Structure 1
Amino acid sequence: QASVCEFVAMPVSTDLQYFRTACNPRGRASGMLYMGDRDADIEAIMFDHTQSDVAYTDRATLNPWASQKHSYGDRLYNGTYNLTGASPIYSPCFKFFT
């Protein structure tokens, strides 16, 4: 069975040492795993770019084209806005953006 490849745009001057380990395709590490103070912290991890990244703690996000609240990759691949809903093909990075 042929597996589809989804393409995410990002700047050319990208630190290549990110992709040499187990990385995140969104460009900013995120998720359910980091909590301990309140309930409205998942959105602050995933979208608030005032504070730095949780994993690589010297920057906000590797790409600013697929990481913000309403960026290109987030407007295209997030399941909430449902742009690719008429597509009958599975998107392999739906789970990383929703």
Structure 2
Amino acid sequence: QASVCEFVAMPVSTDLQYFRTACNPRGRASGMLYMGDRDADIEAIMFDHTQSDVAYTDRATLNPWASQKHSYGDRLYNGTYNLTGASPIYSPCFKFFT
């Protein structure tokens, strides 16, 4: 069975050391696995670009085209806005953006 490949737009001048290890395709590490103080921190980790990335604590996000709250990659591959709902095929990067 052939497996699909979903393409995510991202700038050319990208630090290639990110992709040499187990990275995250959103460009900014997310998830519920980072907690400790409050409850409304999921949007803060995933979408608040005032503060830095959780994993690489030097920069906000790797690409600003698929990481903001309403960026191109987030508008195109999130399940909340549901732009690709009618397509019968699988988007393999749906689990990283929702």
TM-score under structure 1 length normalisation: 0.99
Q: Give a deviation string over 1:24-64, Cα, whole Å, max 9, x none.
A: 00000111100111110011000000000000000000000
Q: Counterparts of 1:57 and 1:30 in 2: how far apart (Å)?
A: 13
Q: Counterparts of 1:55 and 1:14 in 2: how far apart (Å)?
A: 17
Q: Counterparts of 1:56 and 1:30 in 2: how far apart (Å)?
A: 12
Q: Counterparts of 1:69 and 1:29 in 2: how far apart (Å)?
A: 14
Where in structure 1 are there 5+ consecutive unaligned residues? none
Following superposition, the deviation at residue 23 of structure 1 comes to: 0.1
Following superposition, the deviation at residue 80 of structure 1 comes to: 0.3
Following superposition, the deviation at residue 82 of structure 1 comes to: 0.3
SS of residue paired to 2:44: helix
SS of residue paired to 1:74: helix
- RMSD in angstroms over aligned alpha carbons? 0.3
SS of residue paired to 1:50: coil
Task: Specify the alignment match of 2:67 in structure 1.
Answer: 67
Runs of 4+ off more than 4 Å: none
Following superposition, the deviation at residue 72 of structure 1 comes to: 0.2
Following superposition, the deviation at residue 88 of structure 1 comes to: 0.2
Where in structure 2 are there 5+ consecutive unaligned residues? none
- Residue 29 (str. 1) matches residue 38 (str. 2): no
Following superposition, the deviation at residue 4 of structure 1 comes to: 0.3
Number of residue pairs the alignment of both structures matches: 98
